[model samples]
Target chain A: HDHHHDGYQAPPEDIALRVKALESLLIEKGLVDPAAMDLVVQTYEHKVGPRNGAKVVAKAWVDPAYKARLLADGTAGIAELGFSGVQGEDMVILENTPAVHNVFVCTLCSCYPWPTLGLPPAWYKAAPYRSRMVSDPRGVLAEFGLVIPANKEIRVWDTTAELRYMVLPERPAGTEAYSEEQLAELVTRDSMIGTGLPTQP
Target chain B: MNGIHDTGGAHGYGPVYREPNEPVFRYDWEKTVMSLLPALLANGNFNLDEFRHSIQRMGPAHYLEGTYYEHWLHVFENLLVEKGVLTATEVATGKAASGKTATPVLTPAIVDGLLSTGASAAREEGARARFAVGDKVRVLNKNPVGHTRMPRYTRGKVGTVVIDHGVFVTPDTAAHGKGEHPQHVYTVSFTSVELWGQDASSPKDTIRVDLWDDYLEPA
Candidate 1:
């Protein structure tokens, strides 16, 4: 987590104090709320936690109909498995078709489907992802080590408040008769979020 | 104050970037402090000075306000527990909490339960506008304040009605002091070129945006 600030010096005490004071003022003026701070913290603790998305992926692998339903109605579909709302309401399940791929982003803010995916990865909320994904999806996917064939289409779903997204990744080969519990282990969080596909053991 | 979700063509913002390779924090002490804030507020036991000091110590780069929606999920759980809508045992021992060891306390199940209640209530109130799947519509190029779910990048764009998601609680963006405007919510699908331009390599590329009913019409 280091920023690699090799030669960075600490700010002057007075300036640091002023910055602290300003932030406090912002919180007090209602520009930001302590509850907001708590909410953000708790989000990582209690909601949008990573395992839930993994669970969804596992379920998709074991049940094709559920996967189909997830693609058709991600909200109610996920809700059927009990993963709806808060951030899930705006969800759309994107299937990784044979001739296509899918990924997701929120350019304006980190408008993620928390109900399904839990909290977004730090990179997702970064300005870099927000700025480049829509314009250069192929490049972005390449960065993730996902090099789609030129002939294959890549559909990028931009999640807004009204619609959210989950990636229905193609089930990996060599896991035909796997139980749902065994299949769930292969469903990585990133795959469900449309970043990477789950690998077979 | 714009509703947290209402981002669109506020000033010609383009499509979002995608960086899916970042780490999502599980549980940390910082978030625990955050989780307890609502109770502090309700009990009048919060100290602005202490809270400020704690936040400052966390550093600016450590947190961002835009993550509030996820945070609110936890708050809703706390509120529900406090209000006796759910018992601590019932809240704590739910499938979400029990099934996933690494799962956060405010799992999607809980969030959906909260939003569904509101959404169902909105449906009962007959707040939805007239629209159906396959209808062509254009997003309204207007801005209103409060908690609207409409994103700015979508305004004034044309799209096809993909789903009639039915009436849900409107975000009421005006209440947040952004601007006051009424809108009916709908999910509209737009081709990648429609949002961008024809030169877009993926012509068949499509995006589904949640639009306020007011943002669309026969176009």
Candidate 2:
């Protein structure tokens, strides 16, 4: 993918080789199965991923009643769309408004809502993101190019307990008449994480 | 154990660069590590609590030294060795010494069933929550040597309970081989100023953390 540059590359080749070496040993030991591994990769890649959250957000935007329900009760609201699972139990949805903005971090660890968002991106769990976001939220977000206004209160949520959280960013301007599918196309993974806003089509 | 991993307010980690088209696994080796996780769990070799504890057990020096999945890879190997499932010599040399089994394939049906349904999340219990949605509380100051969900920044800080997130198993005891001490977990909201004093840049900002009953006291 286009995501890897020297900026903060993945582990060195030596670490990669060791990881592969260990996994091969596991597979050879009958300790693990290659089939299971493939399923996990496939599950996150295609079946369930950031797109799931995008769909939920898009539907809510197009349907006010759905948005109301999601805001009132995220677990049931998200479940209504068959998106409930492990990391997403008793979830709460935070809506971003002209007066408010929201973001998520698991200061303790990278405990993301895997059901809706799949695995967290590297930056979400990186020391820089987790360590600084909670304290200097607006500054950290600015690095991602999301500058919360001074008048609006920025809300940073730490997902310490199992109660998962997701941000419902305000529908970008000029998207008032887009179909749910088209709106979903505009919802990127960073938008849900509050690091990036949804761009208008 | 105020380890370096509880990096909520610490600084100087450096800039975050983005990859517009980051692949799920930049290296196939990452997929191999990711695949190994659930595969091991499916075999019942270890539980999720043990897995988390393994990652948290790292000393600050080594913890910050490695990347996310690198740490995971480190723990994965450690668990296999600690559990006595993988001998050091065997893993180092990729030679089978003893105690290797086969044929417990994690078929599609099994893997799908497990991850799809997801293991039971919140624990079953009949107890009521001590705090409600509007109660004020303070994060407990105590820090244990074992696994804890409380980050160092939130310790001893005052906040308000915004949501009563039902009953769930507490990981503190669970990580230590004790059963999930089921209790109510609350999403406690704290202001940036309240957490960092007047030095807060985003004073209008408020941060919420999910805290179990054990981590709170009436403020």
Candidate 3:
């Protein structure tokens, strides 16, 4: 993939040097272990991510009892699928319906459910999305090419505190016969964040 | 504190940029900074609130202009110096002044256990909810010169308590090392008209905020 196409402009080269200098200093001070840090990065970079949440969504879409438990208590339900961690200690699973559209933003900062979503995308942390999402959600969604109907209410969850929220997108039509594994394929990361919808079968 | 990082409603940042099939870390250095903060936190160097407040203390221009992991890097350098764990001179020179060496607390062996059993903010101490579900509540209008989870947009706006999200550490005191001050957090639902005036996109739309008991008052 072309580095330039990743959307955000790259930071200056000096900042990377600064980070290196700081890491060296911290390691010298015996404050951080390099091996431990590597393991932590591997955990988020590969071990945990939206795939875990996608599996949960797939199960919920197929199992009514699981969906009920998910809506009732998201942490336990998410833990049931074996995805639980730092940013996701407490969870709120927001259900999208024909009458309601759900989205999430951390107005103060980029507070995401790391255990399920991995690190947030650059847009989720960028100033534009943080500033306008709560104020003008529909307009922000338009930027994502997501236009909600006027009749449906848009509920934007500002994840300010410890409680993290994940949107349970409405399962796509004509996928009732699909297995959980097949259904998980349709769950896009943005769909769970409410910026986009599930991919149609 | 009403720092620049509290960017809920203030605008002028143009359009939201979306990266297709975005990689978790664009640069290798980003992955280093990404895990470094959590290691520091797991090592008990600073609490999550303190880490956030340190990022908020960054210059408004830098805060807006820098990348996300850059902010994390800034917090590490800032807090390390502020806590006197490492001196600014040492960070700049990449050298240790003293010959003293200490063992790192966050080892690779414990990373799995630490991540799976995450650092939950919920306290075992009994704290009752001041506001129940379906109760009309208003966010406090007061603004202090310290860290707070309360957003500027919800200030003085009336909303309904939709969910009692249990008791957790209050960021206000926790950021300053004052105390955990555990309290109930509720999902308060505010109409778009209430938050953004009549210029809202839809009268039916609403924004729900996870606010602590201290930030809210009976309407």
Top candidate when judged by TM-score against the true structure: 3
| Model 1 docking tier (incorrect/acceptable/medium/high) | incorrect
DockQ of each: 0.16, 0.57, 0.66
Candidate 2, superposed: residue stretches over 4 Å from native: A1-7, B102-105
For candidate 1 chain B, the 10 contiguous residues with the lowest summed lDDT are B95-104
Error of 2 at B198 (Å): 0.8
Which model scores highest in DockQ? Answer: 3
- B136-208, model 3: which lDDT tens digit per residue? 9999998988898888888999999999878899999899978888889999999888888886547879999
Best by lDDT: 3
Q: In model 3, which runs have C-alpha deviations exceeding 4 angstroms?
A: A1-7
Model 3: colliding residue pairs? B1-B146
Q: Give chain A TM for each model in order.
A: 0.76, 0.88, 0.95
Global CA lDDT computed for model 1:
0.54
lDDT of model 2 at position A48: 80
**Least accurate 10 contiguous residues by lDDT in model 2 chain A:** A1-10
The stretch of ten residues in a row with the least summed lDDT in candidate 3 chain A is: A1-10
